[PDB]
Amino acid sequence: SGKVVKFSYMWTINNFSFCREGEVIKSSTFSSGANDKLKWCLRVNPKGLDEESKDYLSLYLLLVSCPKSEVRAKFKFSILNAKGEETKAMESQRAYRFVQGKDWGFKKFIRRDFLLDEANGLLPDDKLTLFCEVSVVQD
Amino acid sequence: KADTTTP
């Protein structure tokens, strides 16, 4: 069997301003690898993860299940503006080692005040569109 | 650098 070895997941969160959430928003599960056997999701802390990131939105890629032991993968997160352009990109500098149940991401992905300022056009109609591009280098 | 929330 062949494998989906790179993939891009687009996720829109409606009414983001009214996200009454350390509380997590979880995306749908999406699949990768051979026979859809690698399962992933995105997880968002809209008000931060811990106290040191209260001013930020945190965003993580989580490996939900995998057939073997480890998966090594590079990943990139970005926000799509109204024009569909990628902006505020952050990417792993290297492949990270994932095992079933483990996440990797950015506690300080983006400042809340920057995200909430309408002049930056990142919440058109109160909608946050995240973009996650993954490249699996092993498994 | 990326961070993880799980031990």
Side-chain angles (χ1 to χ4, degrees), chain A residues 1-17 19 22-25 27-42 44-46 48-51 53 55-67 69-73 75-82 84-92 94-106 108-137 139, chain B residues 2-7:
Chain A
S1 163
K3 302 178 170 186
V4 169
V5 307
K6 321 192 201 293
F7 44 101
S8 319
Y9 182 74
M10 179 177 305
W11 184 23
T12 288
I13 305 177
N14 309 274
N15 295 311
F16 175 80
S17 274
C19 264
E23 279 171 300
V24 290
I25 306 183
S27 83
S28 74
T29 296
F30 45 103
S31 309
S32 159
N35 305 288
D36 297 326
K37 283 192 300 169
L38 296 184
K39 299 187 177 310
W40 312 84
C41 78
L42 296 191
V44 173
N45 295 307
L49 180 65
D50 48 55
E51 182 269 350
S53 58
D55 303 333
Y56 289 81
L57 173 141
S58 324
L59 171 65
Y60 294 87
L61 176 61
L62 172 67
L63 182 63
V64 170
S65 62
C66 63
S69 189
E70 61 196 348
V71 174
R72 296 172 49 238
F75 57 88
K76 175 170 92 153
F77 299 132
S78 66
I79 300 176
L80 302 183
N81 54 25
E85 314 192 320
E86 301 187 32
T87 190
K88 283 295 182 176
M90 212 164 275
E91 57 166 28
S92 55
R94 59 171 179 81
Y96 278 82
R97 199 180 167 263
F98 290 82
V99 295
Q100 190 175 296
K102 187 189 191 71
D103 61 356
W104 286 110
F106 302 105
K108 292 174 189 183
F109 178 57
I110 187 167
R111 303 264 302 187
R112 289 194 55 85
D113 47 13
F114 185 84
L115 193 55
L116 295 169
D117 184 5
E118 321 77 19
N120 306 307
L122 302 188
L123 297 170
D125 303 311
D126 207 351
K127 302 175 184 309
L128 173 66
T129 296
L130 298 173
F131 197 59
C132 172
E133 298 195 290
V134 186
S135 300
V136 173
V137 312
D139 204 305
Chain B
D3 62 285
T4 183
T5 72
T6 49

Coordinates of all heavy atoms in Angstrom, one line a residue, chain A residues 8-58, unseen atoms left out:
Chain A
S8 N -2.3 18.9 3.9 CA -2.7 20.2 4.5 C -4.2 20.2 4.9 O -5.1 20.0 4.1 CB -2.4 21.3 3.5 OG -1.2 21.1 2.8
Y9 N -4.3 20.6 6.2 CA -5.6 20.6 6.9 C -6.0 22.0 7.1 O -5.3 22.8 7.7 CB -5.5 19.8 8.2 CG -6.8 19.6 8.9 CD1 -7.8 18.8 8.5 CD2 -7.0 20.4 10.1 CE1 -9.0 18.7 9.2 CE2 -8.2 20.3 10.8 CZ -9.2 19.4 10.4 OH -10.4 19.3 11.1
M10 N -7.2 22.4 6.6 CA -7.8 23.7 6.8 C -9.0 23.6 7.8 O -9.8 22.7 7.6 CB -8.2 24.3 5.5 CG -8.9 25.7 5.5 SD -9.3 26.3 3.8 CE -7.7 26.1 3.0
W11 N -9.0 24.5 8.8 CA -10.0 24.4 9.8 C -10.5 25.8 10.1 O -9.8 26.7 10.5 CB -9.3 23.8 11.1 CG -10.3 23.6 12.2 CD1 -11.6 23.4 12.2 CD2 -9.9 23.5 13.6 NE1 -12.1 23.2 13.4 CE2 -11.1 23.3 14.3 CE3 -8.7 23.6 14.3 CZ2 -11.1 23.1 15.7 CZ3 -8.8 23.5 15.7 CH2 -10.0 23.3 16.4
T12 N -11.8 25.9 10.0 CA -12.5 27.2 10.3 C -13.3 27.1 11.6 O -14.1 26.2 11.8 CB -13.4 27.7 9.2 OG1 -12.6 28.1 8.1 CG2 -14.3 28.9 9.6
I13 N -13.0 28.0 12.5 CA -13.7 28.1 13.8 C -14.6 29.3 13.8 O -14.1 30.4 13.7 CB -12.7 28.2 15.0 CG1 -11.7 27.1 14.9 CG2 -13.5 28.3 16.3 CD1 -10.7 27.2 16.0
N14 N -15.9 29.1 13.7 CA -16.9 30.2 13.6 C -17.2 30.8 15.0 O -17.0 30.1 16.0 CB -18.2 29.7 13.0 CG -18.0 28.9 11.7 OD1 -17.9 29.5 10.6 ND2 -17.8 27.6 11.8
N15 N -17.5 32.0 15.0 CA -17.8 32.8 16.3 C -16.6 32.7 17.2 O -16.8 32.3 18.4 CB -19.1 32.3 16.9 CG -20.3 32.6 16.0 OD1 -20.5 33.7 15.5 ND2 -21.1 31.6 15.7
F16 N -15.4 32.9 16.7 CA -14.2 32.8 17.6 C -14.2 33.7 18.7 O -13.8 33.4 19.8 CB -13.0 32.9 16.7 CG -11.7 32.9 17.5 CD1 -11.2 31.7 17.9 CD2 -11.1 34.0 17.9 CE1 -10.0 31.6 18.7 CE2 -9.9 34.0 18.6 CZ -9.4 32.8 19.0
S17 N -14.7 35.0 18.5 CA -14.8 36.0 19.6 C -15.6 35.4 20.8 O -15.3 35.7 21.9 CB -15.4 37.3 19.1 OG -14.4 38.1 18.6
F18 N -16.6 34.6 20.5 CA -17.5 34.1 21.5 C -17.1 32.7 21.9 O -18.0 31.8 22.1 CB -19.0 34.1 21.0
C19 N -15.8 32.4 22.1 CA -15.3 31.1 22.5 C -15.0 31.2 24.0 O -13.9 31.4 24.4 CB -14.1 30.7 21.6 SG -14.4 29.7 20.2
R20 N -16.1 30.9 24.8 CA -15.9 31.0 26.2 C -15.0 29.9 26.8 O -15.5 29.2 27.7 CB -17.3 30.9 26.9
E21 N -13.8 29.8 26.3 CA -12.9 28.8 26.8 C -11.7 29.5 27.4 O -11.0 30.4 26.9 CB -12.4 28.0 25.6
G22 N -6.8 27.4 29.4 CA -6.5 26.0 29.6 C -7.5 25.1 28.9 O -7.3 23.9 28.7
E23 N -8.7 25.6 28.6 CA -9.8 24.9 27.9 C -9.4 24.7 26.4 O -8.9 25.6 25.8 CB -11.1 25.5 28.0 CG -11.8 25.3 29.4 CD -13.1 26.1 29.5 OE1 -12.9 27.4 29.6 OE2 -14.2 25.6 29.7
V24 N -9.7 23.5 25.9 CA -9.2 23.1 24.6 C -10.4 23.1 23.6 O -11.5 22.6 24.0 CB -8.5 21.7 24.6 CG1 -7.2 21.8 25.3 CG2 -9.4 20.7 25.3
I25 N -10.2 23.5 22.4 CA -11.0 23.3 21.2 C -10.3 22.2 20.4 O -9.1 22.4 20.1 CB -11.3 24.5 20.4 CG1 -11.8 25.7 21.3 CG2 -12.2 24.3 19.3 CD1 -12.1 26.9 20.5
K26 N -11.0 21.1 20.0 CA -10.4 20.0 19.3 C -11.0 20.0 17.9 O -12.2 20.1 17.7 CB -10.7 18.7 20.0 CG -9.5 17.8 20.1 CD -9.7 16.6 21.1
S27 N -10.2 19.8 16.9 CA -10.7 19.7 15.5 C -11.2 18.3 15.3 O -11.1 17.4 16.1 CB -9.6 20.0 14.5 OG -8.8 18.8 14.3
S28 N -11.8 18.1 14.1 CA -12.1 16.8 13.6 C -10.9 16.0 13.4 O -9.8 16.6 13.2 CB -13.0 16.8 12.3 OG -12.2 17.2 11.2
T29 N -11.0 14.7 13.4 CA -9.8 13.8 13.1 C -9.6 13.7 11.6 O -10.6 13.5 10.9 CB -10.0 12.4 13.8 OG1 -10.0 12.6 15.2 CG2 -8.9 11.5 13.4
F30 N -8.4 13.8 11.2 CA -8.0 13.5 9.8 C -6.9 12.5 9.7 O -6.2 12.2 10.6 CB -7.6 14.8 9.1 CG -6.6 15.7 9.8 CD1 -5.3 15.7 9.5 CD2 -7.0 16.5 10.9 CE1 -4.4 16.5 10.2 CE2 -6.1 17.3 11.6 CZ -4.8 17.3 11.2
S31 N -6.8 11.9 8.5 CA -6.0 10.7 8.4 C -4.9 10.8 7.4 O -4.9 11.7 6.5 CB -6.9 9.5 8.0 OG -8.0 9.3 8.8
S32 N -3.9 10.0 7.5 CA -2.6 10.1 6.8 C -2.0 8.6 6.8 O -2.6 7.7 7.4 CB -1.7 11.0 7.6 OG -0.3 10.8 7.3
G33 N -0.9 8.5 6.1 CA -0.2 7.2 6.1 C -0.8 6.2 5.1 O -1.4 6.6 4.1
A34 N -0.6 4.9 5.4 CA -1.1 3.8 4.6 C -2.4 3.4 5.1 O -2.6 3.2 6.3 CB -0.1 2.7 4.7
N35 N -3.4 3.4 4.2 CA -4.8 3.0 4.6 C -5.3 3.8 5.7 O -5.9 3.3 6.7 CB -4.9 1.5 4.9 CG -4.3 0.6 3.9 OD1 -4.9 0.4 2.8 ND2 -3.1 -0.1 4.1
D36 N -5.1 5.1 5.7 CA -5.7 6.1 6.6 C -5.3 5.8 8.0 O -6.1 6.2 9.0 CB -7.2 6.1 6.4 CG -7.6 6.6 5.1 OD1 -7.0 7.5 4.5 OD2 -8.7 6.1 4.6
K37 N -4.3 5.0 8.3 CA -4.0 4.5 9.6 C -3.3 5.5 10.5 O -3.2 5.2 11.7 CB -3.0 3.2 9.5 CG -3.8 2.0 9.0 CD -2.9 0.7 9.2 CE -1.6 0.9 8.4 NZ -0.6 -0.2 8.8
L38 N -2.8 6.6 10.0 CA -2.3 7.6 10.9 C -3.4 8.7 11.1 O -3.8 9.3 10.1 CB -1.0 8.3 10.4 CG 0.2 7.4 10.2 CD1 1.3 8.3 9.8 CD2 0.5 6.7 11.5
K39 N -3.8 8.9 12.4 CA -4.9 9.8 12.7 C -4.5 10.9 13.5 O -3.8 10.7 14.6 CB -6.1 9.0 13.3 CG -6.6 7.9 12.4 CD -7.8 7.2 12.9 CE -8.3 6.1 11.9 NZ -8.4 6.6 10.5
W40 N -4.9 12.1 13.1 CA -4.4 13.4 13.7 C -5.6 14.3 14.1 O -6.7 14.1 13.5 CB -3.5 14.2 12.8 CG -2.4 13.4 12.1 CD1 -2.5 12.7 10.9 CD2 -1.0 13.4 12.5 NE1 -1.3 12.1 10.6 CE2 -0.3 12.6 11.6 CE3 -0.3 14.0 13.5 CZ2 1.0 12.3 11.7 CZ3 1.0 13.7 13.6 CH2 1.7 12.9 12.7
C41 N -5.3 15.3 14.9 CA -6.3 16.4 15.0 C -5.5 17.6 15.5 O -4.3 17.5 15.9 CB -7.4 16.1 16.0 SG -7.0 16.2 17.8
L42 N -6.1 18.8 15.4 CA -5.6 20.0 15.9 C -6.3 20.3 17.2 O -7.5 20.0 17.4 CB -5.8 21.2 15.0 CG -5.2 21.1 13.6 CD1 -5.3 22.5 12.9 CD2 -3.7 20.8 13.8
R43 N -5.6 21.0 18.1 CA -6.1 21.4 19.4 C -5.7 22.8 19.7 O -4.5 23.2 19.4 CB -5.6 20.5 20.6
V44 N -6.6 23.7 20.1 CA -6.5 25.1 20.2 C -6.8 25.5 21.6 O -7.9 25.1 22.2 CB -7.4 25.9 19.2 CG1 -7.3 27.4 19.5 CG2 -7.0 25.6 17.8
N45 N -5.9 26.3 22.3 CA -6.2 26.9 23.5 C -6.4 28.4 23.2 O -5.5 29.2 23.1 CB -5.0 26.8 24.5 CG -4.8 25.3 24.9 OD1 -5.7 24.7 25.4 ND2 -3.6 24.8 24.8
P46 N -7.7 28.8 23.1 CA -7.9 30.2 22.7 C -7.4 31.3 23.6 O -7.1 32.4 23.2 CB -9.5 30.3 22.6 CG -9.9 28.9 22.5 CD -8.9 28.1 23.3
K47 N -7.3 31.0 24.9 CA -6.9 31.9 25.9 C -5.6 31.5 26.6 O -5.2 32.0 27.7 CB -8.0 32.1 27.0
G48 N -4.8 30.6 25.9 CA -3.5 30.2 26.4 C -3.6 28.9 27.1 O -4.7 28.3 27.4
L49 N -2.4 28.3 27.3 CA -2.2 27.0 27.9 C -2.0 27.1 29.4 O -2.8 26.6 30.2 CB -1.0 26.3 27.2 CG -0.7 24.9 27.8 CD1 -1.9 23.9 27.5 CD2 0.6 24.4 27.2
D50 N -0.9 27.8 29.8 CA -0.6 28.1 31.2 C -0.7 29.6 31.4 O -1.2 30.3 30.6 CB 0.7 27.5 31.6 CG 1.8 27.9 30.6 OD1 2.0 29.1 30.3 OD2 2.5 27.0 30.1
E51 N -0.2 30.0 32.6 CA -0.2 31.4 33.0 C 0.7 32.2 32.1 O 0.5 33.4 31.9 CB 0.1 31.6 34.4 CG 0.0 33.0 35.0 CD 1.4 33.7 34.9 OE1 2.4 33.0 34.7 OE2 1.5 34.9 35.1
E52 N 1.9 31.6 31.7 CA 2.9 32.3 30.9 C 2.5 32.6 29.5 O 3.2 33.3 28.7 CB 4.2 31.5 30.9
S53 N 1.3 32.1 29.0 CA 0.8 32.3 27.7 C -0.6 32.8 27.7 O -1.4 32.6 26.7 CB 1.0 31.0 26.9 OG 0.3 30.0 27.4
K54 N -1.1 33.4 28.8 CA -2.4 33.9 28.9 C -2.8 34.9 27.8 O -3.9 35.0 27.4 CB -2.7 34.5 30.2
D55 N -1.8 35.6 27.3 CA -2.0 36.6 26.3 C -2.0 36.0 24.9 O -2.2 36.8 23.9 CB -0.9 37.7 26.3 CG -0.9 38.4 27.7 OD1 -1.9 38.4 28.4 OD2 0.2 38.9 28.0
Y56 N -1.9 34.7 24.7 CA -1.7 34.1 23.4 C -2.8 33.1 23.2 O -3.4 32.5 24.1 CB -0.4 33.4 23.3 CG 0.8 34.4 23.2 CD1 1.4 34.9 24.4 CD2 1.4 34.7 22.0 CE1 2.5 35.8 24.3 CE2 2.5 35.5 21.9 CZ 3.0 36.1 23.1 OH 4.1 36.9 23.0
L57 N -3.0 32.8 21.9 CA -3.7 31.6 21.4 C -2.6 30.5 21.2 O -1.6 30.8 20.5 CB -4.5 31.8 20.2 CG -5.1 30.6 19.5 CD1 -6.5 30.9 19.0 CD2 -4.2 30.1 18.4
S58 N -2.8 29.3 21.8 CA -1.9 28.2 21.6 C -2.5 27.2 20.6 O -3.8 27.0 20.6 CB -1.6 27.5 22.9 OG -1.5 28.4 24.0

